Design a protein around this ligand. Structure first.
Ligand code: ADP
Ligand code: GLU
Ligand code: MG
Ligand code: MG
Ligand code: MG
Length: 672
């Protein structure tokens, strides 16, 4: 489904309704609860979301660019080609990036669907490729993008983002980018749907300074002292003057939403039997998030540089961080512009501003509790709340909520709305959840607790129930990797729900936040250590020790395989003792190779995508020992990515990247 249009409101015009929107949205929340609160027995439907990047290989120029010109695809697949999609059980939606695709199954999977995940993901890829080859045919006849070859790649990061000649538009700086006002990203990186440039503007204005994301550079032998791509400019005030102050020696400087939301990830959503189970599942998936973030790492480079981290998360965290310097407890960089650190916050409300520690895109703040093992002391972190909102969720005549669950919403509501259409100002709170969806959906966290709609009353057995979204996974090049990780979380989720009586996953939130920073460090999967529970089978216990990813996956006591994966395969009867038995199974071979891919990366035998791209850059003939990714390095890299994506072992790169056994296996074995 394509996002439907309207009159967007710019920040100065919109900010006067922040409070109207919040009130009305809570009201809607209340109705959702009153109507759907008592759903029970919802089945385990679930599905993934994939995100893709259309890359234009200009082979003759030896240049890989982001393709910002075939974006009609997203409308085509949703109008005249919406039937191809449906026939095929796939669905396409727009994403921040004009070069980006997003796609899901058209219907959620029900329980264990085997290789069908991968099948469905491959159909998504084939359809994009199909339409692209169509455009290539039309273009040829219209004499357009000559020498050009567009391919969709599930990259987490585009390695040359905001670097010279990184988009397939001639002379993109010959006009101004009023939306980002970025030094590096022409606004053509933004998807045309009004919502996206709106968000981009609203945050910058609210903030009163460009977003700013500094990423530690890798320290090669000739690496410059500073990010020498910073330049001075006079299009925009204050923005063009901000760089000198905001940047830092030994740090990749990035200054635009697209650096973050122009990144891709894998997401999986799950429906629990009911709100109570959903709380329990959400809570228990909290510490999986930073672990899977480390495990899945696929983004070792930004803005032309090898970074000294392997994942996207902090970059996306900064890319939409609407916090004024007031909200961050820091000096404005340009005080005559950003008046008293309040940026765009209306005068009449500056007095009710709070120091807020985390970007509205950031790791979960609070366990929701409501289950045997939960105790409020686990929420041991700084989490500012909207007390009016808490008040009203505690004391109202439609759905009085428990304190813990009230606090979660109360925390989401410390944010202002950042894109609102004029049409939409007054809703019927009994039927619309749009206003709440405004705040719900611009709190982008590692999980998301998804209420349903007011229309999802218990008698309606088919409407979406109470869901948990697992958001941290970096996205992988191959549909096999992404299916594998999708099934991993599926199994974990199933385990969790099947043994809900016996699994205590709680740990102090503060260790989770720490985990979330460890998870960024370069080669983290290979050696760093994380706070993980000592035992899950054990009421009244919340000890952690510090384990490696290898341990966290494989420890008999508290490992993901022996504690989560292996047990649920037993009660389903896929094996009797051990997951490895699958290698020999008739009905279930592919599952073996998923889990083995998973195992072998956790134990460091097989590399992460992040590792593999790093090695690749580091040993490229044109590599200059200075952390620089040149057009050429980028081109050959993305060329490998293309072949890898297609199981093309002609240069032994697949064997090199998945090892012999698995490479052979997938080369010789297509899904279901
Ligand atoms: N009943 C359901 N239970 C769980 N997950 C579902 C259900 N229906 C759809 N999904 C999945 O929810 C995800 C939401 O898709 P999307 O429209 O991209 O929303 P968002 O961007 O809010 O995650 C998809 O992966 C989809 O297949
Ligand atoms: N592309 C974002 C996900 C944002 C979204 O689509 O909800 C990420 O890497 O997390
Ligand atoms: Mg989506
Ligand atoms: Mg998405
Ligand atoms: Mg999602």
């Amino acid at each position: 489904g394509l996002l439907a249009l309207g009159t967007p409101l710019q920040w100065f015009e919109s900010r006067t309704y922040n409070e109207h929107i919040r009130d009305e949205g809570i009201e809607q929340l209340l109705y959702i609860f009153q109507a759907a609160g008592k759903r029970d027995n919802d089945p385990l439907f679930w599905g993934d979301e994939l995100e893709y990047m259309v890359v234009d290989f200009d082979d003759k120029e030896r240049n890989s660019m982001l393709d910002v010109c075939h974006d009609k695809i997203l409308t085509e697949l949703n109008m005249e080609d919406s039937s191809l999609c449906e026939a095929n059980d796939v669905s396409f939606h727009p994403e921040y990036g004009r070069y980006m695709l997003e796609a899901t199954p058209a219907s959620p999977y029900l329980n264990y669907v085997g290789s069908y995940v991968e099948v469905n993901m491959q159909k998504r890829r084939a359809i994009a490729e199909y339409k692209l080859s169509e455009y290539a045919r039309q273009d040829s006849k219209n004499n357009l993008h000559v020498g050009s070859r567009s391919v969709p790649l599930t990259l987490t990061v585009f390695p040359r983002m905001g670097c010279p000649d990184f988009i397939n538009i001639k002379d993109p700086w010959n006009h101004k980018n009023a939306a980002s006002r970025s030094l590096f990203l022409p606004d053509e990186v933004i998807n045309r749907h009004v919502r996206f440039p709106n968000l981009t503007a609203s945050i910058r204005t609210r903030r009163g300074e460009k977003v700013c994301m500094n990423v530690p550079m890798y320290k090669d032998i000739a690496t410059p002292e500073t990010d020498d791509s910073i330049y001075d400019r006079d299009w925009f005030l204050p923005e063009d003057k901000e760089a000198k102050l905001a940047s830092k020696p030994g740090f990749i400087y990035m200054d635009s939403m697209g650096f973050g939301m122009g990144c891709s990830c894998l997401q999986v959503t799950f429906q629990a039997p009911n709100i109570n189970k959903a709380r329990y599942l959400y809570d228990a998936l909290v510490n999986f998030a930073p672990i899977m973030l480390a495990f899945s790492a696929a983004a070792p480079a930004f803005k032309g540089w090898l970074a000294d981290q392997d994942v996207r998360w902090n970059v996306i965290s900064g890319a939409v961080d609407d916090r004024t310097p007031k909200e961050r407890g820091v000096a404005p960089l340009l005080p005559k512009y950003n008046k008293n650190g309040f940026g765009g916050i209306a005068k009449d409300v500056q007095d009710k501003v709070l120091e807020i520690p985390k970007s509205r895109y950031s790791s979960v703040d609070l366990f929701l509790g409501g289950s045997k093992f939960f105790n409020r002391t686990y929420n041991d972190t700084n989490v500012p709340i909207n007390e009016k909102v808490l008040g009203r969720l505690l004391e109202n005549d439609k759905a009085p909520l428990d304190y813990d669950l009230a606090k979660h919403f109360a925390h989401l509501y410390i944010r202002d709305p950042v894109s609102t259409f004029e049409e939409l100002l007054n809703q019927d709170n009994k039927t619309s959840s749009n206003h709440f969806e405004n705040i719900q959906s611009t709190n982008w966290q590692t999980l998301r607790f998804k209420p349903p709609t007011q229309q999802a009353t218990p008698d309606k057995k088919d409407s979406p129930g109470w869901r948990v979204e697992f958001r941290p996974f970096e996205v992988q090049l191959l549909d096999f990797e992404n299916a594998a990780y999708s099934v991993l979380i599926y199994l974990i989720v199933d385990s969790i729900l099947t043994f809900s009586d016996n699994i205590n996953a709680y740990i102090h939130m503060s260790k989770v936040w720490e985990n979330m920073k460890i998870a960024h460090h370069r080669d983290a999967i290979l050696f760093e250590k994380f706070h993980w529970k000592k035992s899950f089978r054990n009421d009244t216990d919340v000890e952690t020790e510090d384990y490696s990813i290898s341990e966290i996956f494989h420890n008999p006591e508290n490992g993901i395989f022996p504690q989560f994966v292996t047990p649920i395969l037993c009660q389903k009867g896929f094996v009797t003792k051990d997951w490895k038995e699958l290698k020999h199974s008739s009905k279930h071979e592919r599952l073996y190779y998923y889990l083995k891919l998973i195992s072998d990366r956790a134990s460091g035998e097989l590399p992460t995508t992040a590792k593999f791209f790093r090695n690749f850059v580091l040993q490229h003939p044109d590599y200059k020992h200075d952390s620089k990714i040149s057009k050429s390095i980028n081109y050959d890299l993305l060329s490998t990515c293309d072949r890898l994506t297609h199981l093309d072992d002609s240069k032994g790169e697949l064997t090199s990247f998945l090892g012999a056994e698995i490479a052979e296996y997938v080369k010789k074995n297509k899904p279901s």
